[PDB]
Amino acid sequence: EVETFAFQAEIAQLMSLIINTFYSNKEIFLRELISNSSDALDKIRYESLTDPSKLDSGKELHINLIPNKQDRTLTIVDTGIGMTKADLINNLGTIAKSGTKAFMEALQAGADISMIGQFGVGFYSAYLVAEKVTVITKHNDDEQYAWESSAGGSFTVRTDTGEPMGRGTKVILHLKEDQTEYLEERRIKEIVKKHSQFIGYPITLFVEKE
Ligand SMILES: CSc1nc(N)nc(-c2c(Cl)cc3c4c(cccc24)COC3)n1
Numbered sequence: 029e030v031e032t033f034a035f036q037a038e039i040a041q042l043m044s045l046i047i048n049t050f051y052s053n054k055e056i057f058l059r060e061l062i063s064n065s066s067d068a069l070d071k072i073r074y075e076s077l078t079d080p081s082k083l084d085s086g087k088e089l090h091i092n093l094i095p096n097k098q099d100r101t102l103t104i105v106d107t108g109i110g111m112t113k114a115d116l117i118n119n120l121g122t123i124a125k126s127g128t129k130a131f132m133e134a135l136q137a138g139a140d141i142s143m144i145g146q147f148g149v150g151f152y153s154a155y156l157v158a159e160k161v162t163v164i165t166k167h168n169d170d171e172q173y174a175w176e177s178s179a180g181g182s183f184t185v186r187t188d189t190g191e192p193m194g195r196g197t198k199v200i201l202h203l204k205e206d207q208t209e210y211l212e213e214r215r216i217k218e219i220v221k222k223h224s225q226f227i228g229y230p231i232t233l234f235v236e237k238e
């Protein structure tokens with residue numbers, strides 16, 4: 029069963045701004061997704077201090093970067109807190125706790141897209157480089173779900189089976205044809221060193237088999 033939802037208007041407008049604004053410094057998407065992963069890891073780390081059983085789904089707190097040139101995807105995986113179905117719909121489909129409104133106003137008053145992470149919406153910078161984003165997530169309190177959107181004002185949510193994660197979130201970027209530089213090992217290493225060198229969890233960049 030696949031459920032289809034409309035983004036809240038302001039989120040659809042934010043997405044359109046990211047997709048349509050001329051902006052060359054696209055590499056910042058990776059820092060933004062790694063920052064979200066680090067925050068999700070801080071959350072499970074903290075919750076586990078008072079409830080160690082929350083790590084029964086995996087004790088290791090880490091981030092993996094997985095390029096795949098055959099599929100033209102870059103995947104950012106973490107073992108963070110993850111999202112229940114409701115968290116997934118609220119966090120990715122609505123303004124919720126984000127600074128969506130403040131960011132859109134800021135862009136009209138001198139700010140630029142690289143500042144997106146100051147407004148709680150850095151995830152949407154994935155649309156600088158991806159034509160489609162799939163988010164697979166597993167929270168201790170729920171089953172595994174897959175969210176997906178190619179923008180255009182809608183997204184889908186369905187249960188995900190056959191490839192269970194212990195806990196965390198996987199952001200799969202289906203790259204635009206002209207954005208394949210983000211699959212190259214030297215490019216990913218350069219961006220991690222420039223923007224994510226102080227993250228407090230291991231970031232492992234996978235090597236390609238062929
Ligand atoms: C809550 S667990 C989590 N893990 C990771 N890696 N990312 C997110 C996350 C995603 Cl996937 C997307 C959005 C988020 C927002 C806030 C906080 C976390 C997230 C709002 O923009 C969408 N949440």
Ligand SMILES: [Mg+2]
Nearest residue numbers: 145146147148
């Ligand atoms: Mg802020």
